[PDB]
Structure 1
């Protein structure tokens, strides 16, 4: 009632801004079971449900997001220099599909602003991480950058020391040429540079490095990414970003808007990409599963397919804050029904049957 009112009155971008403000001010029951704890990426996670990148692009609402019940928070994407992103309108709801299309184009306050914001709460975060509530930082590249690898390297040096993990986002559909960085040769060069930069940070400031990939890759592209990840010792994968596909059956009036599609229509394309990447990496590379999670069943499907952790965003825009607790409670119930001792036991379970 209260959320749909404000959202019917506001365009989606305005609603997003209000949600970030409300969350940041802490204007918002479930106590996490031991069954939901996961140890991965060199950290304890109190529960495996995180907020996906894009909700808190500029690191303004981190503490409010933990208050909402997320086991981990990812901020970004952050670009080196501030930039405005694409012209409006750039976000569209597809209510009949429980989906969103966005073409933000990496609107970002930039590394310096975000650095200072995170520094203001750096020791608070250190305590939260120790308590099982880690922080990830997702890095992008500026529109007019002439050297993509140097943009990512700048991000590692500036925000790496404030993050438990960093994400090399090479899968936004809304920056020209970006997804080409997922190609074997480009990815290997880029990731070598990123990992060199990371390894140069002092030990207590040295994050894990993950790569976030698209749902629209060819089988060759996926095989290539798996090979590079193993070759270089990349710490994990985030699977997946939004899709440039438009699955048959979309009903929303705005289905043919340009941008990345998220929410329910992405769900099974993302799950199958998790499944493939888990197999190609022999289950040895942690995966954060994302795309269309709005229930415990959705979360458990991704975990059984190979995800160690999951994230959501689009479900929050339809169902609000209560969806977080709902996913967690449902996931715990399913784990019990299916005879798992906890989340850890379920990771990759479909591959072992």
Structure 2
């Protein structure tokens, strides 16, 4: 509760919280507590990584979705994350799908959600980030970068314009932007469309002043065909996209799911998604010749999970669902185990392990 013991949180606190509140209420309370610093490991130089034009104290970040409106950024750094990504944020505010829209699958250490981009909107997030803009400038310079994930409104008629608007409004406040076109919960959120979309996004980005010019990454699904991945890699290299976030939640339902809510509509996250994501990272790393930075996401809950994605090609990793089951202590746990594994496997540091599986 205030100490920081992994067993207490995993075995007592978290289980009790879930027994008292529904999943969405639990998340909202989580955001409140985090934003208030109500939280329970020292990063070694081994965990430091330099990519996307920035230094990262450690390669473990909080995935988009936990802090959709940028309300708990500072609390998240306090929790131990090497970098924070907020969003997705839509141009105009919107409520998202009706409740219930998030479901726990305890037996699978997984979650299914269909929020549908509930967002305070660009304007509100912009002011919220501006209020701590200088503080973030010092955090970034200190190895704690900030990412902003962009989405689009449900009733938007010009997808590309929605993202362009996001680039113009929040781009100046972020170290990196994410073009999220892999959410399974928005209408119909492709080589042709992607090229057109990203060309416009990059042009908008290049039009920003130097110190306010963020890297641009594309977040993709784990349900892509081989052709889709092949085309994405081609477009990425063609336009000079700075990086990829692999992956978002899956619309598939892997055989073996035990949770009673396994058939709810939405994207599945957690352990059942882990390896499908790692494999997607492996494939994208190869298709891009290891020249395009990858942020690996999907079922990371331990040092081994993180290292597998790093060895597969990820320069950084993110987690979300593991936090909902184990609580804040999982962050230090993952970092401590990653450090130990790097040593055991002969890597001088995280950097040396990036893509290691491909050079064996």
TM over 0.5: yes
Deviation at 1:4, TM superposition (A): 2.0
Q: Could you give the per-residue CA deviations for residues 317-342 of structure 1, whole angstroms, max 9, x where no partner exists?
A: 00000000000000000000000000
Query: What secondary structure is seen at the aligned counterpart in 2 of 1:255?
Result: coil
1:30 aligned residue: 41
Match of 2:239 among 209, 232, 235: 232
Structure 2: how far apart are the matches of 1:18 and 1:130? 30
Q: Which residue is equivalent to 2:150?
A: 139
Q: Give the distance between the partners of 2:117 and 2:111, measured in 1 at CA.
A: 16
- Counterpart position of 1:158: 169
> How large is the RMSD of aligned CA atoms in angstroms?
0.6
SS of alignment partner, residue 112 of structure 2: strand
Task: For 1:37 and 1:73, locate their aligned partners in 2 and report how far apart those are by CA, in whole Å.
Answer: 15
Q: Deviations over 1:247-278 (max 9, x none)?
A: 00000000000000000000000000000000
1:160 shift after superposition: 0.1
1:278-333, Cα deviation, whole Å (9 max, x unpaired): 00000000000000000000000000000000000000000000000000000000
TM-score (norm 1): 0.98
Deviations 1:211-261 (A, max 9, x none): 000000000000000000000000000000000000000000000000000
Displacement of 1:2 in angstroms is: 2.4
Match of 2:131 in 1: 120
Could you tell me which runs of 5 or more consecutive residues in structure 1 were left unpaired when the two chains were aligned: 178-182
Residues 97-129 of structure 1 show CA distances to partners (whole Å, capped at 9, x for unaligned) of 000000000000000000000000000000000
Confirm whether residue 217 of structure 1 aligns to residue 228 of structure 2.
Answer: no
SS at match of 1:118: helix
- With the length of structure 2 as denominator, give the TM-score of the two structures: 0.96
Structure 2 segments unaligned to the other structure (5+ residues): 1-11
Work out which of the residue numbers 88, 91, 95 in structure 2 matches 1:77.
88
User: C-alpha displacement at 1:25, in angstroms?
Assistant: 0.2
What is the rounded CA distance, in whole Å, between the counterparts of 1:7 and 1:29 in structure 2?
A: 18
Question: Post-superposition shift, 1:3?
Answer: 2.7
State the 1:96 CA deviation. 0.1
> 1:160-184 CA deviation, whole Å, 9 max, x = no partner?
000000000000000011xxxxx00
Q: 1:262 to 1:342 in 2, by over 3 A?
A: same
Q: Moved runs in structure 1, 4+ residues, more than 2 A? A: none
CA distance in 1, matches of 2:297, 2:29: 24
Please give the secondary structure, in 2, of the residue aligned with 1:113.
helix
1:198-223 per-position Cα deviation (integer Å, ceiling 9, x unaligned): 00000000000000000000000000
User: Would you say how many aligned residue pairs link Structure 1 and Structure 2?
Assistant: 348
Q: Hey, what's the Cα distance between the residues in 2 that align with 1:82 and 1:8?
A: 31
Counterpart residue number, 1:180: none
CA contact (8 A) 2:40 2:328 kept: no
Structure 2 Cα separation of the partners of residues 52 and 320 of structure 1: 14
Shift of 1:29: 8.7
State how far apart, in whole Å, the 1-side matches of 2:62 and 2:256 are: 27
In the TM superposition, what whole-angstrom CA distance separates every residue of 1:19-52 from its partner, at most 9, and x where no partner exists?
0000000000900000000000000000000000
Counterpart Cα distance in 1 of 2:103 and 2:166: 29
Cα gap change, 1:346 to 1:29, in 2 (>3 Å)? farther
